[PDB]
A paper describes a structure:
In both of the distinct RNAP-Ocr complex structures, Ocr remains as a dimer upon binding to RNAP and the Ocr dimers are slightly less bent compared to that of an Ocr alone crystal structure. The second structure involves only one of the two Ocr subunits within the dimer contacting RNAP, occupying only the downstream DNA channel. Here the RNAP clamp is less open and we denote this structure the ‘narrow clamp structure’. In the narrow clamp mode, the proximal Ocr subunit interacts with the β’ clamp, again mimicking downstream DNA in RPo although the clamp is more open (~45 Å) compared to that in RPo (~35 Å). Interestingly, although an Ocr monomer surface mimics that of a dsDNA in the overall dimension and the negative charge distributions, the Ocr subunit in the narrow clamp structure does not exactly overlay with the downstream dsDNA in RPo when RNAP is aligned on its bridge helix, the highly conserved structural feature that is close to the active centre and connects β and β’ clamps. Instead Ocr is shifted upwards compared to the dsDNA in RPo. The downstream binding channel of RNAP consists of β and β’ clamps on two sides and the β’ jaw domain as a base, providing a positively charged environment on three sides, required to accommodate and engage with the negatively charged DNA during transcription. Although an Ocr monomer has a largely negatively charged surface, there are also positively charged patches on the Ocr surface, especially those facing the β’ jaw domain. In order to maintain the interactions between Ocr and the β’ clamp and to overcome charge repulsions with the β’ jaw, the β’ clamp is opened up, shifting Ocr upwards and away from the jaw domain. When the clamp is closed as in the transcriptional open complex, even though there is ample space to accommodate one Ocr subunit, the charge repulsion between the β’ jaw domain and the Ocr surface results in the opening of the β’ clamp, thus shifting Ocr upwards and away from the β’ jaw domain.
Author numbering:
A (entry chain G): 5 to 108
B (entry chain F): 5 to 110
C (entry chain C): 548 to 696
D (entry chain E): 1 to 75
E (entry chain C): 797 to 945
F (entry chain C): 1244 to 1341
G (entry chain D): 14 to 1049, 1058 to 1067, 1075 to 1088, 1097 to 1126, 1133 to 1376
Amino acid sequence: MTYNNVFDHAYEMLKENIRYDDIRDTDDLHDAIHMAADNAVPHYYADIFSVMASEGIDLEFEDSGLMPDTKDVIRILQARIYEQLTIDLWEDAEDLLNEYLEEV
Amino acid sequence: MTYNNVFDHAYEMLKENIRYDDIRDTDDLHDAIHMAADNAVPHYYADIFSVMASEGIDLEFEDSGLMPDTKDVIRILQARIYEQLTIDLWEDAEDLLNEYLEEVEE
Amino acid sequence: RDVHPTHYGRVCPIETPEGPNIGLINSLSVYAQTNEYGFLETPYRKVTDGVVTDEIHYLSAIEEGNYVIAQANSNLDEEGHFVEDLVTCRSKGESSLFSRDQVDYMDVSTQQVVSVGASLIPFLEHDDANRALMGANMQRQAVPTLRAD
Amino acid sequence: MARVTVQDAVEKIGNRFDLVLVAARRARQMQVGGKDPLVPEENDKTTVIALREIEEGLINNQILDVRERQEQQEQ
Amino acid sequence: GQNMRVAFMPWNGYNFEDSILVSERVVQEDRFTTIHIQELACVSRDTKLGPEEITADIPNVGEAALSKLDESGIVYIGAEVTGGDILVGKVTPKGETQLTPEEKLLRAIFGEKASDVKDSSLRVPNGVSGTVIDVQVFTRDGVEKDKRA
Amino acid sequence: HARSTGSYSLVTQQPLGGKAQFGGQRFGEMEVWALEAYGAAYTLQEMLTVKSDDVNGRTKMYKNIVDGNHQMEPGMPESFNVLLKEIRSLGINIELED
Amino acid sequence: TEEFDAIKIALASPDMIRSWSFGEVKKPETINYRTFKPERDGLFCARIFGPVKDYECLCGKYKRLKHRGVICEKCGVEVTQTKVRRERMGHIELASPTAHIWFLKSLPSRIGLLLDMPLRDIERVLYFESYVVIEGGMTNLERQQILTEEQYLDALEEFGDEFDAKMGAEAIQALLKSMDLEQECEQLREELNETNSETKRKKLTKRIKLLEAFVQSGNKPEWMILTVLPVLPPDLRPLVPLDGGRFATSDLNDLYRRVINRNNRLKRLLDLAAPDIIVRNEKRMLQEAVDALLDNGRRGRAITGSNKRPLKSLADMIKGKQGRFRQNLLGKRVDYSGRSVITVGPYLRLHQCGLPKKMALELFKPFIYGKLELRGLATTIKAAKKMVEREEAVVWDILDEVIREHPVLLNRAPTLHRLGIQAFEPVLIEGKAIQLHPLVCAAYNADFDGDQMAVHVPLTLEAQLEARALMMSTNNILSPANGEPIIVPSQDVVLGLYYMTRDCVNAKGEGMVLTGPKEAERLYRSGLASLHARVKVRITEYEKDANGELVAKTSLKDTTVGRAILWMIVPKGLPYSIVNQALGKKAISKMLNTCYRILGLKPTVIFADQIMYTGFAYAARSGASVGIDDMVIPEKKHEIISEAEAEVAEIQEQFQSGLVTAGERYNKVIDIWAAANDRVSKAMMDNLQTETVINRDGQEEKQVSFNSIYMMADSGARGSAAQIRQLAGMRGLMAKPDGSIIETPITANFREGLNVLQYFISTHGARKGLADTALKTANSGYLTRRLVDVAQDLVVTEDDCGTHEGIMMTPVIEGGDVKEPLRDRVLGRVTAEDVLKPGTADILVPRNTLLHEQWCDLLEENSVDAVKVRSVVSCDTDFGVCAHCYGRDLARGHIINKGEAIGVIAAQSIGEPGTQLTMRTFHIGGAASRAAAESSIQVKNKGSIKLSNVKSVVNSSGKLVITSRNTELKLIDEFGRTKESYKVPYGAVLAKGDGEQVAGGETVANWDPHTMPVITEVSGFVRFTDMIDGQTITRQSLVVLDSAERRPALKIVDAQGNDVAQYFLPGKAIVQLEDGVQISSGDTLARIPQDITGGLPRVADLFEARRPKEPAILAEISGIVSFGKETKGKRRLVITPVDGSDPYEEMIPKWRQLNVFEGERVERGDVISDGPEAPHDILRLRGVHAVTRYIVNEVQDVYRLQGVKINDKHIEVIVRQMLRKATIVNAGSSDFLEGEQVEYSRVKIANRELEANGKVGATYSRDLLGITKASLATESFISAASFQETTRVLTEAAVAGKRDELRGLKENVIVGRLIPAGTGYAYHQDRMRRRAAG
């Protein structure tokens, strides 16, 4: 269980969401990808912390407005995991729209 | 998996600190624990997210005064390892004090 | 770790050890006594309308939350008549000026705000609080001397 | 003569860092043997003697190289 | 503690911020001369083989050190131990070495390793001086320690 | 404090020094950076290997002080050798160049 | 032996291992537990690694070992290389070579895996159920596909003969040999040039750079698969983590005999020709044994270690057991250094301290042994050990010969900076405690209450030279971080010189016509006090009117006796105006500062020592006492208190009135009691006059008193007014951590008797102030830890920097009065070739000079505006820094030398402030409001003013207001120096018309944070809009519309009868008028109002370079920018039309403010002021200059809130260390759109423009990521990631083939060598010159 396993799981869930919803528009990918961000993250805190021990994810933030305001630790790192997975899934969703238009 | 190595290293360094500073009470014996809490903790986020993923440490706190109040997560995750190490090493320090009085034939 | 005004005569704010745990060990004061339930109670003498009765009672926190407690340093003659029209007093911990008959309690002696550890130091008004704490940490350790003057 | 600051020895050759190794390679020959000091001792150690020999401006890299080649040719 | 005559002045530097300058008369009066009584806790190891009792007559000890000990490895009450002096005789038991084909001359001279290779005596680690006070050899039910106690 | 060179020490002079119960450590983690701030190299070299973490080096330095040689013999004594034996144990080795 | 400079970690060849050790091994009977004898050959036993005891061999014949290169029966004869233990290792022979697990699993699949194949399928085909077919062809499948048992059966049925597929790594070897590396690199460069997927870009660049590492590494990747493996020595093993065993009964022996047993069973079953399932089981168990021997073989979380699995990983014993942090972290045998209680010694001039007798008898025990061997007094070593024990007189004579001129180090345990350890000279002191020099307490940051200090003995001659050359207290006079002198007298010498130079009226002795001056002889004999009146004595004095000489003069001056005695202390003629006043901390510190500036270094140390001696010797003769007569009570104090409580009673009447709320009553109580505290402070200051007088009456001041507390308060050394007011008068308020305070504070003082409630409430101040000490210590240590961890790879290596470009030095301050002048910033740094007078064709320096106080006096007597300063980053230096820009090195006076360690002084300069800032500047109250009357923006100093970024707004009145966002003011002081940084608000109401200048008075601005500059320039009524509900729900004459929830800009009305400028959107807009109302120009149309510096986490936010809460988007080169500019359907503010094309169109998520209204053409580097600025965009567009000024001025704005002063050189060095990771745009020779080193980029540009190419590789942009990867940007594996896993770094540096090339300071701490700094760099340069010389 590393970052590449969560990456492949989010890739497979995004392929399943494109196959189910049949979305061919770039602006209409808002309902899928965030759900692909929602179902790919783990709930156990050790499964969260085991992903951070591998390469592929960083601690720096692209946008500070996506981080919530809390006093804990797991919420900030969890939102960082959501942000890194969405940054991956935009460029993944472009190539999956290409493969969906060139597949069937 | 990796918390056991940090625990063994902290136990060894704390045993060497009580062996070196040769104090024989339970009231003033805390500066050797400050040596263990400041040295045995890992530095950057790689081992910190690696040790806490392993068993032996939890998120909840025993004492309310040692919890830091900041927005940086790495300070809180370092003070977590420090506080858990002091709580898990107080009783081991007293056990090695009980073993310490008749350990070395001198 | 901070000080609440219930810590007046029950425990002392002075005696704390010099380690990291400073503020959490409160030594019990001179005149305080544990009640039969388990809470601490410091004595107060009864004040009537005309005279001051020499008997004492033991008051708890729930009782003193509604009662009125006078200060320790206030004037008193031989009989018990209050010669001051405006005696400086307090109600719930903060000092505020009351009348001569709005209080019905009085401190027995001027010793309840300090425990037995720092009661050996004369003039605790004229010393700073942290320095009185430091003097307590000096008095907590001393080898006996041979002459013992 | 207790030396306070070696700065007057830095006025001859200014690096503050060559002086230690030059004084060390000068004083190893006086500590082991087979050499005589050019400055008489003022009841001190060889360290103060090395500082005063660098301060007087008698020993530098060139004199050490010439004496090293002379000791290699004599041996 | 004890009180002394204090002069409130800045001196020649011997009191910088809170330092203390004392007199020689305080040393002359033997004032606050501390008396530290430490414990000599002796041990007699019991192994699987060999006798159990720690006795006297330990070799490789000079006669100047053996003159201050009584029988069964205890010193007289009033004898001064200074650093490496022997207060109690440490004895390794006679096991673990009788079934040895080698070192027969070592077993004849300094048998069964009665002393260590190069260690100090078991009284106090070095740097001290002082006399003994009281010996507290306590016995077991059926142990035969009459000659020592 | 300040124990002397005592016997029965296999690493870091920790067992059987001159004290009640002795142990040799705490040179510090900030004092090393202070010696870096001065630019001290040979004092830091003693803090690395010879004064700190060598068994043969203490005997060589004791012979140099007692015999009157006063020779430091600088280099990398028996710590980088342990590092080479632990790195070259795997499938990767360490060469030797200028 | 040789040294270790730059060695790669390349793959060990099988031929190099067969030449490393040669021989045959069979029948592993390694260790017999019942014999303990040298057995036969075996593996990892006494037959290998030579003998087990030092010089002998038990083989049966030839124990002398004449020949070399044979293994005869049972011993190792061949050594041939090194000593007994450091010789060759050995070898094991595998029948099936298995691959290394660190390439197969590089956490995760990082390096050693990619071959256009996923990780899971490669993990599956290395198991027992799948395999990879090799050398195929003429089918539909390929060689990269995966097969099962039935699929490979069908494949061998269809393909027939010549089918090859092996279960082990031999098929991987044949596939890697069949694939050409150069053709694969060409195909991947073509796929990089053709494809456009963004996730494909980084993968193809990683593939191309890894294959270039394989090509320019010059080695075969098939050496990654382990064929022949060497073993490790048995004594390389440490003891087990459990109870003490032996080296043969260790934890590694079971895994070793398991691997060797499976190897021999594989050999036996291949000699027996076992069937396929048996040999596949043997290869599977062999691969499992190798994978369990190398690492633990974890796949996921690894939920539970299997009952403390004995030596699961080799990396765990490399990193954890032996320790990656092996040197200088655990402490490692302090070895003749010890602690004691520090006392004071009022003698032993500055380069000397005390040392106890019984400690110094023991500290030099081998030196005593060596000198007793040298003098011939001790024959044997046991005779010397007996002579030490006897303690006779000749042993003390030899010890006096030892300690006579030998240095030592005194070293406290908190060393937050470099002056915590200082070298001195020991002198024997009777007792067990250490006497210290009195004035070294501020450098040690501790008082004499039993604090300890280790006593490090320099054991080598070079360590003695390091102590006496660099670490003495006389070498360091100034501070190495500020320039202020660190040796400051503290309340002893200060009080002695204050009582010495104190004047009196009508004392004994008058009209002293004296020569010599010799005013101490009549003080000593009779009739003269040292505090006499103004007498005229003859005082000679030296001056420096001649260059390099001394000009003596002679004059009679009116002075006191103590100043005449103090002039005998002063050598070589200091100026007289600095000793003609009262001496406190400031005066004596300024005297020592001017003595250091004038006389140099040699007279100022004996001056400071003699000042200390006379201060001690006259403070002993002073005899100041603190009595009850010294403490004074104000005579009106109670009355003031009565007045105070009377006012409280009036407020109490307001408390019964119902007009004053709770917080207003609290603020009035705070104000009344603070005014009463100020009145009793002034009453105490008036009552300190005329207490202890001489016999004189009828004067005005009437003999200013000589009590001790007023002398300590006026001297200003330790006696401050904030504690004299707590001694006498009124104590006032206290400090409570909850934030509240009582309403009737302490009326009495420590002179009078306090109440029990007053002491009970005053205990809370101690409770608040005690908790500050223990907190934030580990955080301040961890900040310095990271600042050293990011900045350890910088040493001085060259002589000349060679530039003309540098950071421009501009004098800037904070708001209000002046804080730091320009002369403090010009002093230090070496300037450039051009400094300019306001007169033309006038220069000062030809090229450069060493800027000291004479050039500062030349710039002070002349007029200067801006100074061009040679400085950092710009003119980078290969492999370090030239540091010629680093001029006037602190605590020393000289030009800068090579080999100075830079960066570890920087973290000690940044980390030197304490545990918590104290910026309350008052009690817990104070009634701190937002604005009392106005913001009060005006000018103070004389000179003409210049307004920046302003307009010409048409108004009806004479004044001309502005509506701009950023507005700066330039002031003329000397030649254009501003020295007044007034923060002008965005669109301030200016009372002065634009285009006119005035100096002196006439306050030009009056701004109130309730208005907004949204007005009309042309007179006319309001443009008619539609009033609909929904837009009136906004928050902080009625509002009509709103542009945030949808004031939009419309056409301005230009006629009074016709219904006809640009209105920006600040975020909040409330319409203050009605549509159809006749209004004139310059009136109220619609007005409503709508970076963070200071703090200890603010320092972390500065030096981590994190992204702020509101990022900023800057402006590039000129293009048509205007509101709307063809915005899309969603996600507004997209600027499509740009003249000059420049296809760069950014997309804004509408959260940002409206950018521009004016400036239809812009430039690269324009500010947008979108809250906090983004430093990475300024680094990409503007350059290094504005980023450096931004970081340095924010660090200084943090530092000025507490009064600490740190020079900008250290901060700019940290900025230089944070400007690595230079990303390129134009593709070069060996790089394509990646980030590499700046020095390597300069080397590549120089090699491009040097010989052949015109320009290959240019226009690179820097990065300011901060603390994470810049500390990991050290390209040597020995300090690449020391905290992280060791073998993870070793595999990357093994495949990449990187060189160490000797830049770093913690590198030779982790490895252990002479560090290339200080005198070690001299040894480095001497070795590099003697290598080239022969």
